[PDB]
Swiss-Prot record, chain B:
Disulfide bonds join 6-11. This is Insulin A chain. The chain holds residues 90 to 110 of 110 of the full protein. It comes from Homo sapiens.
């Protein structure tokens, strides 16, 4: 998922993988 | 922001990792 467009749910999937047990926050605003 | 940028353009890994807790 590096070097690609991450749209919609795919950005969330990428964040989940990257951040691991830290978790993350997602803010479309 | 991020949701926009990484969709319309291409973000580096470190831009994503800025949103980890």
């Amino acid at each position: 998922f590096v070097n690609q467009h991450l749209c919609g749910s795919h950005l969330v999937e990428a964040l989940y993988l990257v951040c691991g047990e830290r978790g993350f926050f997602y803010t479309p605003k | 922001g991020i949701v926009e940028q990484c969709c319309t353009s291409i973000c580096s890994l470190y831009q994503l990792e800025n949103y980890c807790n």
